[PDB]
Design an enzyme around this catalytic site. Sequence first.
Site, PDB file in Angstrom:
ATOM      1  N   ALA A 137       0.993  -1.151   0.030  1.00  0.00           N
ATOM      2  CA  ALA A 137      -0.157  -0.205   0.016  1.00  0.00           C
ATOM      3  C   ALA A 137       0.752   1.139   0.013  1.00  0.00           C
ATOM      4  CB  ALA A 137      -0.968   0.108   1.157  1.00  0.00           C
ATOM      5  N   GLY A 168       2.255   5.788  -2.406  1.00  0.00           N
ATOM      6  CA  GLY A 168       1.478   5.071  -1.841  1.00  0.00           C
ATOM      7  C   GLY A 168       0.993   3.756  -2.866  1.00  0.00           C
ATOM      8  N   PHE A 169      -0.177   3.609  -3.118  1.00  0.00           N
ATOM      9  CA  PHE A 169      -0.505   2.346  -3.894  1.00  0.00           C
ATOM     10  C   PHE A 169      -0.137   2.252  -5.371  1.00  0.00           C
ATOM     11  CE2 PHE A 169      -3.960  -0.892  -4.964  1.00  0.00           C
ATOM     12  CZ  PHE A 169      -3.184  -2.068  -4.701  1.00  0.00           C
ATOM     13  N   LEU A 170       0.771   1.506  -5.564  1.00  0.00           N
ATOM     14  CA  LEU A 170       1.148   1.144  -7.142  1.00  0.00           C
ATOM     15  C   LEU A 170       1.297   2.665  -7.878  1.00  0.00           C
ATOM     16  CD1 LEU A 170      -1.191  -1.466  -7.784  1.00  0.00           C
ATOM     17  CD2 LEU A 170       1.396  -1.695  -7.798  1.00  0.00           C
ATOM     18  N   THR A 195      -1.895   7.091  -4.858  1.00  0.00           N
ATOM     19  CA  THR A 195      -2.924   6.770  -4.267  1.00  0.00           C
ATOM     20  C   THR A 195      -2.764   6.414  -2.799  1.00  0.00           C
ATOM     21  OG1 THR A 195      -4.194   5.861  -6.285  1.00  0.00           O
ATOM     22  CG2 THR A 195      -4.442   4.691  -3.998  1.00  0.00           C
TER      23      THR A 195
END
Lengths: 376, 376, 354, 355, 131, 125
Positions: B47, B68-70, B87
């Site tokens: 995450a 953050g996420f990907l 994200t």
Amino acid sequence: QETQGQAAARAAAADLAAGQDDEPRILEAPAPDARRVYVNDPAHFAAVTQQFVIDGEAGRVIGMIDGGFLPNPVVADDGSFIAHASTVFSRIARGERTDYVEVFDPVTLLPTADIELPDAPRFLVGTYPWMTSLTPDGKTLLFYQFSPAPAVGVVDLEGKAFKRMLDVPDCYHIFPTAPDTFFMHCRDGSLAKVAFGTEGTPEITHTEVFHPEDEFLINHPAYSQKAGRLVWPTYTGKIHQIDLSSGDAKFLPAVEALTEAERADGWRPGGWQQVAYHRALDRIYLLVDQRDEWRHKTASRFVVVLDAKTGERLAKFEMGHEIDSINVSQDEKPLLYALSTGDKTLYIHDAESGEELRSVNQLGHGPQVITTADMG
Amino acid sequence: QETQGQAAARAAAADLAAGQDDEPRILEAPAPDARRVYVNDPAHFAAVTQQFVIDGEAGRVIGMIDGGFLPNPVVADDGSFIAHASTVFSRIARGERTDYVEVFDPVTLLPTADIELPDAPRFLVGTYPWMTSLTPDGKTLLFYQFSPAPAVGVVDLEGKAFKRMLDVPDCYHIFPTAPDTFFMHCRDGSLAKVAFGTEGTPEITHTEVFHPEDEFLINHPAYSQKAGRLVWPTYTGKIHQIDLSSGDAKFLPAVEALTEAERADGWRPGGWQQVAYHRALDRIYLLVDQRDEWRHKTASRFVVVLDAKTGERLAKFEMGHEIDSINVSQDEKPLLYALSTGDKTLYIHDAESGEELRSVNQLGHGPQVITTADMG
Amino acid sequence: ADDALAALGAQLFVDPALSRNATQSCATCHDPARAFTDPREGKAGLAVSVGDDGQSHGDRNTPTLGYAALVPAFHRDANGKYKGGQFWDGRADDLKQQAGQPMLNPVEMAMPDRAAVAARLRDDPAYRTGFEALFGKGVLDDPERAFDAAAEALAAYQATGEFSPFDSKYDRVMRGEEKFTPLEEFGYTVFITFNCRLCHMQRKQGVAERETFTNFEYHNIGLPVNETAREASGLGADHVDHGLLARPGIEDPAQSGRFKVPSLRNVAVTGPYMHNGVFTDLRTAILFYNKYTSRRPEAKINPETGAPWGEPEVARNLSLAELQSGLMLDDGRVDALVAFLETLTDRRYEPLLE
Amino acid sequence: ADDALAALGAQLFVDPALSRNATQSCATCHDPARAFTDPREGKAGLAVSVGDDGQSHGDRNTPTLGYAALVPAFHRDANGKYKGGQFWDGRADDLKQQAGQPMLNPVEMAMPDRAAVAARLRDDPAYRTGFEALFGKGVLDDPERAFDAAAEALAAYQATGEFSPFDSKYDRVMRGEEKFTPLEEFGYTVFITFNCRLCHMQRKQGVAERETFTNFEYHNIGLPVNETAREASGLGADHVDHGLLARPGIEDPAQSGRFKVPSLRNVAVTGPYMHNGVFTDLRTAILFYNKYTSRRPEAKINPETGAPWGEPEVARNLSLAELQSGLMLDDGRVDALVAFLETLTDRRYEPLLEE
Amino acid sequence: TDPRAKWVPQDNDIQACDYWRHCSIDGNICDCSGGSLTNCPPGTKLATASWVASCYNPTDGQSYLIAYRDCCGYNVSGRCPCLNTEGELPVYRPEFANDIIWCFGAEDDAMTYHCTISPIVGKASHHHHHH
Amino acid sequence: TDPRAKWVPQDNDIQACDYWRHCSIDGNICDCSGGSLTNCPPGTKLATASWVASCYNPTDGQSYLIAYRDCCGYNVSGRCPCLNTEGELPVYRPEFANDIIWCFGAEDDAMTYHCTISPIVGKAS
Ligand code: HEC
Ligand code: HEC
Ligand code: HEC
Ligand code: HEC
Ligand SMILES: [Ca+2]
Ligand SMILES: [Ca+2]
């Protein structure tokens, strides 16, 4: 000898053969029990972290909980809920800080409370189980604040609200004894009793100083709330035992984890959660090894087991791994949990024989803290 | 021969000897240059994630950037800034999603823009560099959306604001060619050209189909925005070259990265960023190895280097490690970067001789994406 | 030579003939028996000193001359931070430039001019000989040369090992001759781990050869006015002490309210504290730093008054980055700090601690 | 016995003498040439069927009897989901329970009672022979027995291969006897990867032996009232079709607006679509699902009218978890779905595909 | 490589956990994420709080006071991790304790740990920990 | 072990990356974090989206369509990581593409990847 993944393949193969249908759903975790064990991964100061919910009997991961920066896990002794004090930032590790308490349902693992802590009051420190603490009635959560000064936060779990910060002297850790009372360990070598009504100052009493300036007490004492037993090893394996089950601190006899010869031979406690305390058996477990005086946070390969009442050694286990933390389930014929930060594996031993029964690997990045519920 | 930590030890001892004083402070990273290289660590769907800013010449980490996420990283070719589309969630991996774009100063690494993207519109996918893209003027960030339909988001970096979502046909990736124009690769085997304004239906044209339904074009084509060259390998090491420098797609002669005997012997491309293109040299680098046809995402131990005009092989480098992603510096005597997701290690090679020169290890948990700036 | 020059300074330092009415000398205010500070009670207590005329009060506390010779000449460094000089506001470049100013300051020694100074030097046969041996024949007949020579002798006198003996308990502990008491070592540790060492240390890192517990920089720590001292000074209730900004040539508004970091050597015996002598007790000076860190209701209160510290005389350019360290000094740490600071007392002033 | 009972049902199925005015048989509305649906025009197009009196219209579209014998008896499982039964609201438990209902329905075949049905059966010597052979002597003398026996005969006939032949292209492809076209195979892959399979596949997982493309559950997909059908039926402007809640014994307000998932077999030839025949085109039934997923304005529009789909007849208990899949069907996928669904046509009805 | 063994200081490589100044470091050496021995990597915030240790310097035989400082406001670097505990005391003696995220005074109230710098502040000389 | 070798399915261990149903899985096997072969772990949300593969079942010699589905709204589990790509197509054939976080439809807009389940939905044709 059949592993869980294998039995799973066989059952799945059989459902396919028999034409059995089943709905893809969200599983419930098995009801909390004595053999349930939680492993918290502070992930070596990573901004987000994981708690692993483990069935200790099957050595199976039965669920997980995400956390923020150095969260403090708590686990209600009766199994009704878990909770943690956590810390997030609006931009991974930067920006606006939010400290918060979440309370979780122990089978759905769903958050049932999310309580904001005002003014980012959490003490951010490598994880000490007793820097955040449940009162015995599960209604109140107490967390430590260090900056600008030692202080203790009161969180109302029942009302799902933060109440207030308590002033304390130059003291550390929190060991709740009643709905409104907890003890702390102070710099001057005393314990401070803190009683808090609903308003104004708490009433702070000190005990007698019970150790000298040069006798260093570890960051991870074992505390059994239901016993009121505070178990505090020193850097030398000298163990202070403080009874708190009358409301006031009676000091039990000081006891030695290691022999005079062993200490001369360089035997010292070392690791993280270096001490475990079984409540029913009134027993102490201590992670020890031969090490230099200043290698106190390194892994240990041995656990020594001693009667808390007498100080007699009951067994010494060669663990077979580099262990950093230990803890025990609180049932009869308890498991001895031995967590390797290095291996990221919880090794699950029989606490009687010290035999390795099973292990659960891949528990994060640098897991350190084991919590169990005392459900008896 | 002397390591950086060795040289530093030596320098520090000399300062101490000479009673030299220095103010502890926040370093600036050295000016971005051709041999700066960025490594992104999608961390296997963690995450939160990290980018490492690396001096490829010294093989030194000069900075890091949290995400953050990907996230989708992008790097201004002129060196002026880097940015990513990222994200985050209010409770680690759960709750309110915020997608945003950050722009960073490349020497202080401070965010100089934080642009919210409304209604969580980011495509969440294992990182494809060309799923988010800078226009050549560096003023616009374009990011792909998959849900509810293929779409493309326009972010104004200069005015620091989200502009609009563009409806596109059933197409993928975003290769910008101009301030207002980009190509995508379509399900029907065409490229779609998309020209957009501030408002109004975008002008969408299709090229002719350039490949059959059964040739499979990889998720990580190399695109030199400055060259307008799109280098698109298939599963077989067949390379499509599309020239977009005129503003419209010209299909270049197909070239085979592997020989017939090699293909007969199971040589296929494989990895993540399987292809790199050196603009000034007009050379294609393809990660290849002996593999089964459905092992197309595994590491490869060999790089073939081939002339992009002729398809002539110039070299087959034995990399000597499990390499998932390659990329190259865009200066003369380029470095060939070779990132092992398994080793978490960037291996820095002389691109001419393939000789390993130095390496930067400990790059997160599963680093996958190498980005360089084309500055010259 | 440097010997003789300092010996002439030694004479000049205690000679009240350098004041208009011949009632005060450097030593009257910088009393060798009180670590070169003023023991004399005045309208505003020991906060400010009384000049030659017997009524005129200054607006600043009389600082020690001990270790003042260790301060660099006034300059702006490469970070754009001013460092060194003499006076609380750094308005003098060095000890030499400073020396002459008390002689001609009407609220202090109150000589009208350099001529009148030279005339008093000419009265003393021992000065004709002393001066002429070091600076040449007829030096005392030229007011400029005489005044400069006197200032130079005074500066040289102040640079002798007598003003900077480095024989405090701290000095001896750092020589390995003795050890800190548990409380003293705690004080030392606290001093270097809490914000103190960010300003009261010669260096940012490494080992200081001759530590004097000041980085010679200028900071506004947001002190209030000293009412009685200010009243006694007669500068007015309108008056604002702009610290460093008062140095001629300093125009930068970010320097308003900034004062030289004092050397903490002999701090224990040179009360009252700060540029205006507002705090009588050392413990109070320490406590004052808690107003920036502690949220306890008592952090806002001066223990000497039982009332709010008071608003900053200069509200801006506060060193908040350094002061807001997000850490409070509890009673124990203030005790430790007092202990540590007492060890910075010179051998000869160790009797003065009680 | 099994064949004879079915054979009696075949006779009864085509016999107009089971209607008041003798104009109407099961085959009239469940026309074997149109996959057992009603080809006749009424006041509401093909949406609703006209009864024996030649005036009365129903409120629901006449469904196929193809594959209806594969639906389990009505029940509630451990999930608390209702499943099975017959009729759009599953108010009949099974085929036999259903059979008697059109017979006595004044808006349908409109026989006054069971005694009057028996009387008709008594008048035909082939029935006296047929019925008595299967149910005993004097069966036709007893109205309850005669009525029940007819329902059973009719149930049995609907259970024959004739009604559920599984000889569609889909079936042929799944036996390996041929292959899908490119479009059909994409259609199928879409059907199983998008939300359709959450409702229109027998099972949640594994492999169905005789797939009929329904999980036999009840879902409110948020369909509007069919204005013309509702006008024709005469139930009134204030009438709400409550679906499964209208089954006797269902009291659960959460069942309001829920209808049985129709089998998708022969869906291409059994238009118009949905419980009220509201959509004419197969494509339109498919596009309806985009209303819950797509962001674009056109997703809210019924392409047959150019107007919003309209407010759901029952705005509550929508299957939003399933329907709000977050992924829109583009036209490519819609074409793919049509082509796939056409493969679900029985062999004898493949000629009907053309028109 | 033997973690329990008495720690042996060297003065030849600051990136390795046995470098003499790292004698009570916890976390990550800043020199491995773009800082230096005594400076923070870009984008981080230098705390003003420190914990302190007397570290023996093998080279000159002198014990030096290392006032460690944290660079804050980044996620942990993950590079050159090190944990030493020479003279390290429990949390109730915070001035010598190293589990604490010593990020106090950092700009922007940054409180996440990225890495730690190891500057010398003097020549002492403790009591619980002397050479 | 050889990563480049043809993948060899087994039908005897669902936590190993060569389990036959995982032929085009990308991520973590849900069974390793409190889910099962075809159920999500507690606290996560089951996606309705999926991607499919035809996976050979060496138990019965039949290929089956496996419609994978993500359990979402948790940080990636970090247990039993696996990545296989039998019949996996690039992103423009998303029906068969597995880099995508197939969390669409998950309750509470959950879009973070935690683990993947491996249910059969039909025989392969
Ligand atoms: C009437 C009392 C008085 C007399 C007499 C006096 N001084 Fe001062 N001294 C002060 C005061 C008050 C200050 C601070 C003035 C300021 O900050 O503006 C001071 C400041 C100084 C300083 C600067 C020290 C520092 O830390 O900034 C030096 C050096 C000094 N005096 C030396 C002398 C010498 C040499 C003489 C003899 C020529 C002398 N003083 C006469 C009271 C006096
Ligand atoms: C921002 C830099 C800074 C910091 C941090 C700081 N000081 Fe100071 N200190 C000063 C300055 C400047 C003065 C003189 C203030 C004035 O009078 O304007 C001063 C005055 C003092 C005095 C009075 C000395 C005298 O001769 O009058 C004492 C005692 C003192 N400081 C001790 C401390 C201690 C102990 C700490 C740590 C709690 C500390 N300081 C923190 C800069 C600082
Ligand atoms: C007036 C034309 C008409 C006639 C005549 C008719 N039906 Fe129907 N049939 C319908 C309509 C309309 C429905 C759906 C109404 C509802 O669900 O309430 C229906 C539904 C059914 C169903 C349930 C199918 C499903 O999937 O739910 C069965 C079975 C059925 N009819 C069989 C018969 C049999 C057997 C006969 C002869 C005894 C017959 N019908 C006579 C129009 C007719
Ligand atoms: C949430 C459950 C559910 C999902 C998901 C679903 N369906 Fe349906 N479908 C139904 C129900 C229920 C009906 C009957 C609605 C009514 O008539 O009241 C229906 C009706 C239909 C009809 C009309 C059939 C007839 O005989 O009247 C078609 C065509 C259809 N669906 C196709 C699809 C396709 C294609 C998808 C995938 C995009 C799909 N459905 C997804 C439940 C669902
Ligand atoms: Ca003073
Ligand atoms: Ca119909």
